[PDB]
Coordinates of C-alpha atoms in Angstrom, one line a residue:
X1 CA 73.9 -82.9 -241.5
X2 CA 71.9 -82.4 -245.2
X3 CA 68.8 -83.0 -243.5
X4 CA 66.7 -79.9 -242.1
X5 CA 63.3 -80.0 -239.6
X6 CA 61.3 -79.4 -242.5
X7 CA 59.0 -82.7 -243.9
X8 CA 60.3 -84.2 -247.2
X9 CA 57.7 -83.3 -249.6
X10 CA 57.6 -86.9 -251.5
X11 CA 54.9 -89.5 -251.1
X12 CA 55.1 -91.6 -247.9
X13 CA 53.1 -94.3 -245.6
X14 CA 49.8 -94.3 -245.7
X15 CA 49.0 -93.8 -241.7
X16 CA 51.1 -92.7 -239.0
X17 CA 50.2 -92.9 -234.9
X18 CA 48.7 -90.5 -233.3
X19 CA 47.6 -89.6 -230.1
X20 CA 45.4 -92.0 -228.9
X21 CA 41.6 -90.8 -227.8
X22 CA 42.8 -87.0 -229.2
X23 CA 41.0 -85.3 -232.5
X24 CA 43.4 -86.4 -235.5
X25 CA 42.7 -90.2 -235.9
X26 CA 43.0 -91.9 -239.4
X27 CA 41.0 -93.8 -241.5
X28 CA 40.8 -97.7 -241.3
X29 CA 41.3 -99.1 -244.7
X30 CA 43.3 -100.8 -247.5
X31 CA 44.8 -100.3 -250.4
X32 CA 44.3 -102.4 -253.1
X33 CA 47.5 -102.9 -254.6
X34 CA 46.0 -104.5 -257.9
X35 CA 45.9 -100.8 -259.0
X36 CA 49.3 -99.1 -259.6
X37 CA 47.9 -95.4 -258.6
X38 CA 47.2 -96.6 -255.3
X39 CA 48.8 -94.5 -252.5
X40 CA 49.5 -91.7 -255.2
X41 CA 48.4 -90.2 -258.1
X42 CA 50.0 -87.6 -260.3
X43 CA 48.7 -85.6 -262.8
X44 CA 51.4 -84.3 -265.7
X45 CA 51.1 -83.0 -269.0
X46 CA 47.1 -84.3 -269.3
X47 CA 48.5 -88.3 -268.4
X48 CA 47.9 -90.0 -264.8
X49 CA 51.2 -91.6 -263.3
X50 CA 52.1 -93.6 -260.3
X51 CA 54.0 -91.4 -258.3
X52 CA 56.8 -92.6 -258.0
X53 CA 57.0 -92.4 -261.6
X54 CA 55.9 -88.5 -261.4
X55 CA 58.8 -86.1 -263.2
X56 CA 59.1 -82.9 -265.2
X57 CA 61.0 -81.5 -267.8
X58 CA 64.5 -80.2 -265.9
X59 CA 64.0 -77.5 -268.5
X60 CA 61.2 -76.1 -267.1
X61 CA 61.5 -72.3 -265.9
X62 CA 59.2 -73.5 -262.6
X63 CA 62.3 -75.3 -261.9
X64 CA 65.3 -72.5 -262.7
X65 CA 63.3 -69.7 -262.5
X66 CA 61.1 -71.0 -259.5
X67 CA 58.8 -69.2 -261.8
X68 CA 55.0 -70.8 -260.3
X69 CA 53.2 -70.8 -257.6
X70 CA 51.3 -73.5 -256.1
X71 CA 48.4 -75.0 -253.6
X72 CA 47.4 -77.6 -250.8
X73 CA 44.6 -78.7 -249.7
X74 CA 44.0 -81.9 -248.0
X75 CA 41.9 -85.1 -247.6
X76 CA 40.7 -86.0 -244.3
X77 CA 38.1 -88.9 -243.7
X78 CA 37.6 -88.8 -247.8
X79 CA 36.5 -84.9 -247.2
X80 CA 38.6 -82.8 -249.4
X81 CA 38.5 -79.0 -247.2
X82 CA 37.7 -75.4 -249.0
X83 CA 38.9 -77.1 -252.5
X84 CA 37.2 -73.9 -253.9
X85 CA 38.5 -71.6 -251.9
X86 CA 42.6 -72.8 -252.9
X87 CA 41.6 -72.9 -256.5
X88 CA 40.5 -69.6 -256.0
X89 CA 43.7 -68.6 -254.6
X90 CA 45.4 -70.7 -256.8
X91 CA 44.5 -69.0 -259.9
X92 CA 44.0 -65.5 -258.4
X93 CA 47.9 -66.0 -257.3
X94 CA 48.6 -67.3 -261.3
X95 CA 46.9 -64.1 -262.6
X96 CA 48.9 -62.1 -260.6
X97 CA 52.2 -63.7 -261.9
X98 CA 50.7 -63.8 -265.7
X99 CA 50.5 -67.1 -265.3
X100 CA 47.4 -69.2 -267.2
X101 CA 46.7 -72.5 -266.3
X102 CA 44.6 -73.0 -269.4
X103 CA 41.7 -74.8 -267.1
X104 CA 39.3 -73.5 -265.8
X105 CA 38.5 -73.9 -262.0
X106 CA 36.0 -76.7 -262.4
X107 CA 38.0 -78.7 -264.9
X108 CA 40.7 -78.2 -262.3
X109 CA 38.2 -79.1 -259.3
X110 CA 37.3 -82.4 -261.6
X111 CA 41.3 -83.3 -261.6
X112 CA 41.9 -82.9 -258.5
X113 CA 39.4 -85.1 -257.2
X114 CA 39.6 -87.9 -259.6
X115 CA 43.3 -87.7 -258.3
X116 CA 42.2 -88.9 -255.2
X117 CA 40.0 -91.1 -256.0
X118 CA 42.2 -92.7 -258.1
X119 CA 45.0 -93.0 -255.3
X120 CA 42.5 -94.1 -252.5
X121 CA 43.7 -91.9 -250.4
X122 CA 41.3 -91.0 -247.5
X123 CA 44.0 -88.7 -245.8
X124 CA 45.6 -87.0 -248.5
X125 CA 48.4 -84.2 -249.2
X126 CA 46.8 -82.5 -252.9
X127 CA 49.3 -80.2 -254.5
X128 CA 48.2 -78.3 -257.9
X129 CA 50.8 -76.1 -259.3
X130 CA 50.9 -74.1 -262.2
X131 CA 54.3 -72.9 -263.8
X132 CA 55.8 -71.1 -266.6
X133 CA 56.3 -73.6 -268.4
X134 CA 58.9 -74.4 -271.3
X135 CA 58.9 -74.2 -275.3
X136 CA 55.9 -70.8 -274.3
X137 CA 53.3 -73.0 -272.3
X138 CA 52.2 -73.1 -268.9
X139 CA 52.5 -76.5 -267.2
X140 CA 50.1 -77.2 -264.7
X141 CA 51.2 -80.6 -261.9
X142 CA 48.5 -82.0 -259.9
X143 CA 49.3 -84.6 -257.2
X144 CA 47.5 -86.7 -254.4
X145 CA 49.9 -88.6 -252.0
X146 CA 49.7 -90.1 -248.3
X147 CA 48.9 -86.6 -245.8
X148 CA 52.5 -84.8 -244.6
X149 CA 52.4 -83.5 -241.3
X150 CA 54.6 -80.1 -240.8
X151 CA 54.5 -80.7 -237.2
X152 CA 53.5 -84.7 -236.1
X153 CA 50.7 -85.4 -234.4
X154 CA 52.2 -85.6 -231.3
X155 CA 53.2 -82.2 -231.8
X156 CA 49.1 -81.0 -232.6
X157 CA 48.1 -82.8 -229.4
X158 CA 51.2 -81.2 -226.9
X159 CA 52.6 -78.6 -229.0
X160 CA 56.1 -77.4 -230.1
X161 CA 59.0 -75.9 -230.0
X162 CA 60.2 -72.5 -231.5
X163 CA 62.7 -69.3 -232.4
X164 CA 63.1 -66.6 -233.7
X165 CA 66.1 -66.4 -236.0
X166 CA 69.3 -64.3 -235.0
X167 CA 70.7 -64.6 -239.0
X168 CA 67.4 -64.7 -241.2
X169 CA 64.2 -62.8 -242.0
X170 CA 61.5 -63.3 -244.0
X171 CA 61.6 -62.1 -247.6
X172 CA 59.8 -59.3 -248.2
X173 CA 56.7 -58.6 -250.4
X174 CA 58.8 -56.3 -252.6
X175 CA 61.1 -59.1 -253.2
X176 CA 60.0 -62.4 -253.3
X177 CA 56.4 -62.0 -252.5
X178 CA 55.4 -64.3 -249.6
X179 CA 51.7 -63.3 -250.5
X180 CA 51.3 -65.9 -253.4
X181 CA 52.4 -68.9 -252.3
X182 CA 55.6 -70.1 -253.4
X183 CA 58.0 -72.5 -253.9
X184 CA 61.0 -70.0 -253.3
X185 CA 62.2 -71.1 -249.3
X186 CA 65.7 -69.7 -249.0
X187 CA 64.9 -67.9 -246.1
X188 CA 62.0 -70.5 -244.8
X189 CA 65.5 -73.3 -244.9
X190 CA 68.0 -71.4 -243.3
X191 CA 65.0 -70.1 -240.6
X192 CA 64.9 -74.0 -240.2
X193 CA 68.4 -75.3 -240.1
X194 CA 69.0 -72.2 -237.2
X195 CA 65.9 -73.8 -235.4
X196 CA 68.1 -77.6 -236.0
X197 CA 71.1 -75.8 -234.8
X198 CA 69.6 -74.6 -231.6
X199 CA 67.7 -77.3 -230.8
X200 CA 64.2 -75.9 -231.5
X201 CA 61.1 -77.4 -233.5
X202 CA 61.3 -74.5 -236.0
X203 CA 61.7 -70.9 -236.7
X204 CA 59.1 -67.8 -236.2
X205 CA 60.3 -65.1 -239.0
X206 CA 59.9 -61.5 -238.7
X207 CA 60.3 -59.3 -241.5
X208 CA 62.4 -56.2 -242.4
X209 CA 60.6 -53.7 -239.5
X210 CA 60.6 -56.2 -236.9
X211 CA 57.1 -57.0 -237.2
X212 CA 55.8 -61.3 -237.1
X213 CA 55.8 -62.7 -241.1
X214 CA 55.2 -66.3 -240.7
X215 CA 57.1 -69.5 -240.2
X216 CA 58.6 -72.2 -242.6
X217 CA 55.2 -73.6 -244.2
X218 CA 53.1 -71.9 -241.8
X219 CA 51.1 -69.0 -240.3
X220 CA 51.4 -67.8 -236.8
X221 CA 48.5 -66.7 -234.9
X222 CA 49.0 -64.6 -231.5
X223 CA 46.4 -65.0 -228.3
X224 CA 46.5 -62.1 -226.1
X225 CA 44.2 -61.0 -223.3
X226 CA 41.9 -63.3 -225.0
X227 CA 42.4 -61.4 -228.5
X228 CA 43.7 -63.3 -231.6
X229 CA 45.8 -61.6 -234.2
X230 CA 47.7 -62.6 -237.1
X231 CA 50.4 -60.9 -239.8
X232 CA 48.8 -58.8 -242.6
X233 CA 51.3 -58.1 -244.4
X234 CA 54.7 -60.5 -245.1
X235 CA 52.4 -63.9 -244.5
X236 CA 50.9 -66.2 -247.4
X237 CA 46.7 -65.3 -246.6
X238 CA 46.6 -68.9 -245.3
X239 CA 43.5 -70.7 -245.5
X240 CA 43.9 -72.6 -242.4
X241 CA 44.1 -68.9 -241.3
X242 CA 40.8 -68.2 -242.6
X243 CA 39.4 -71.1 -240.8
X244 CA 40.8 -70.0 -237.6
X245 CA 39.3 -66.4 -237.7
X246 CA 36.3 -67.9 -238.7
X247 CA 36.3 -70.5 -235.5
X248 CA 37.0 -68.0 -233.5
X249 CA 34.4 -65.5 -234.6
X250 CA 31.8 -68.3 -233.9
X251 CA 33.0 -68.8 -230.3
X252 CA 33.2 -65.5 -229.7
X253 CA 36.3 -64.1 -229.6
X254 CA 38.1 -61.1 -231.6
X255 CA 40.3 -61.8 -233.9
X256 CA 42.6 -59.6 -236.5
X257 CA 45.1 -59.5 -239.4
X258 CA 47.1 -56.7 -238.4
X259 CA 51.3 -56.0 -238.0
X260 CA 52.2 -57.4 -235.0
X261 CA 55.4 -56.4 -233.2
X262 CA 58.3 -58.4 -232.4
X263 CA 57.4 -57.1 -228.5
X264 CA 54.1 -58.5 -228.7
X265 CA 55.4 -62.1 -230.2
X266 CA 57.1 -61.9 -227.3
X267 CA 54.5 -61.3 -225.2
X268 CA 52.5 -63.5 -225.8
X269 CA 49.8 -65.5 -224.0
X270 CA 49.7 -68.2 -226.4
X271 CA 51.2 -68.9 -229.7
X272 CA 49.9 -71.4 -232.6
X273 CA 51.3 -72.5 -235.8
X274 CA 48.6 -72.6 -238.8
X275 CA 48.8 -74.6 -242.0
X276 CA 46.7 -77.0 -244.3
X277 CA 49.4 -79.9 -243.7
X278 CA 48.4 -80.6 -240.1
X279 CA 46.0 -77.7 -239.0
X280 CA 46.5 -76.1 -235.7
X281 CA 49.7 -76.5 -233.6
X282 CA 50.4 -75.0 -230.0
X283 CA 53.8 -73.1 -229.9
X284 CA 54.9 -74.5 -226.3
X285 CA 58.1 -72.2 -225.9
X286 CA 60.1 -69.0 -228.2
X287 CA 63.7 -69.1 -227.5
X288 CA 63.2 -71.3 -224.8
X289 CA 61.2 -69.3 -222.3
X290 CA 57.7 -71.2 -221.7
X291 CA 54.5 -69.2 -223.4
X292 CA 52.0 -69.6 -220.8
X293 CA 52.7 -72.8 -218.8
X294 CA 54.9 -74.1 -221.3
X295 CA 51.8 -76.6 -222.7
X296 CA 49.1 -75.6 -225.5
X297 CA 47.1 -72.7 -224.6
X298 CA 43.5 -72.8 -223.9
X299 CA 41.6 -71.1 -226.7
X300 CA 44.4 -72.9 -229.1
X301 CA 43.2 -75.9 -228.0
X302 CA 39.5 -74.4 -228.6
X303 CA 40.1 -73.9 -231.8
X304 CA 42.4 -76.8 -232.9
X305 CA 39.7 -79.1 -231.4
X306 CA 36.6 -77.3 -233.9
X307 CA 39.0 -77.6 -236.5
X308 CA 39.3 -81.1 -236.5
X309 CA 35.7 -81.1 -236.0
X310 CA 34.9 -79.6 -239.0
X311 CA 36.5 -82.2 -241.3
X312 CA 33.2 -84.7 -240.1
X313 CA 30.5 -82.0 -240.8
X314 CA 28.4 -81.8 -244.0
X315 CA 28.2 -78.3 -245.1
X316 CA 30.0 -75.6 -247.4
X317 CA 33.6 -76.4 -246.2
X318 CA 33.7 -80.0 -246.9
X319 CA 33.2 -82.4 -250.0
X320 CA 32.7 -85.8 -249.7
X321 CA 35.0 -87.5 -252.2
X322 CA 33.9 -90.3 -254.4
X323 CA 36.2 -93.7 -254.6

């Protein structure tokens, strides 16, 4: 059909089930209908819209040029997670591109927050993206809508499914750079529709020398002999990535950006999937041949548990947002 495993990137419900007694449970509340932003706000050209109202000039070279680049972060029990750390890749990503979003990082880190508050969203899916604009300014689209999973939550608690492509591979940094965050997935879509086609969650790309890049929306993250490694080189820096290494340095264990080979992919003792939209998912299977036992790994579930965690504890990684 038309329709790939990817999420549709559009506002949605407000809650979804998930696995009872497990780390990801939602917030219990309302929204009060009275206002129109509830369950999403959108910020576009300086005015506030319901989302579903939300649209940009056609004519804008973000759209024919792809010509942006973009960020997530999201809400979880009215905690917005690292919002400093994604504007400062959000704007270090726009320099690089000679991009100006004509804010600055706190006027940004105002707007972005309002946008939640505004669309009482205690679970949230925050996009900000900055583009080149059309007649020359640079048009910067904030948004705050119900919280996407790239993987469901049943799929955090038991894991998934994945291959690795026969047909595709990950663009390169030369081309189009997978190091700023994009909005460019030709690859990332046909990586998915081969996972459709062969009856797999999703797609693990390598790149051009056979080393792991990263998968459709996500970063991969390798366990082996109690060692966790990740891509350095044809991956987004991922933030959930960051988290990860940092999790892991606290219990203990080592863990490196580095190339890793398509052997050691293979190889693996466990496998995870890394991204703001859902955290940390175990990769069950790769071309259909168990990883371990088949089940989430131990020291993903470590770490996927203290993620979660995190999201409850005062301290530098969380803000409490303000309704």
């Amino acid at each position: 059909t038309g329709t790939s495993n990817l999420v549709a990137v559009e506002p949605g419900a407000i809650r979804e089930d998930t696995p009872p007694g497990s780390v990801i449970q939602y917030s219990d509340y309302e929204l009060d209908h009275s206002s129109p932003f509830a369950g999403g706000v959108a910020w576009i050209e300086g005015e506030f819209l319901p989302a579903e109202d939300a649209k940009i000039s056609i004519f804008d070279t973000g759209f024919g040029h792809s010509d942006l680049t973009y960020t997530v972060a999201h809400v979880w029990h009215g905690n917005i997670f690292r919002l400093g750390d994604h504007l400062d890749r959000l704007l270090d990503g726009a320099r690089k591109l000679r991009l100006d979003a004509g804010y600055t990082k706190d006027e940004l880190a105002d707007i972005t927050k309002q946008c939640v508050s505004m669309s009482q969203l205690r679970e949230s899916f925050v996009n900000l993206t900055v583009t080149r604009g059309y007649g020359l300014t640079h048009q910067v689209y904030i948004y705050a809508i119900p919280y996407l999973w790239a993987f469901p939550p049943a799929e955090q608690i038991f894991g998934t499914t994945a291959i690795v492509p026969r047909h595709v591979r990950r663009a390169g940094r030369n081309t189009v750079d997978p190091t700023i965050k994009n909005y460019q997935w030709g690859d990332l879509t046909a990586a998915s529709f081969e996972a459709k086609d062969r009856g797999a969650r999703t797609a693990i790309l390598l790149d051009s020398d056979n080393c792991v890049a990263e998968g459709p929306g996500f970063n991969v993250c390798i366990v082996k002999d109690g060692k966790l490694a990740s891509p350095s080189r044809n991956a987004l820096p991922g933030i959930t990535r960051k988290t990860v290494f940092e999790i892991a340095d606290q219990m203990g264990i080592e863990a490196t950006l580095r190339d890793v080979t398509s052997h050691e992919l293979y190889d693996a003792d466990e496998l995870m999937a890394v991204t703001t939209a859902g955290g940390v998912t175990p990769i069950n299977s790769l071309d259909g041949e168990a990883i371990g036992n088949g089940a989430p790994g131990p020291m993903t579930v470590a770490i996927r548990d203290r993620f979660w965690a995190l999201m409850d504890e005062p301290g530098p990684l969380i803000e409490a947002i303000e309704y």
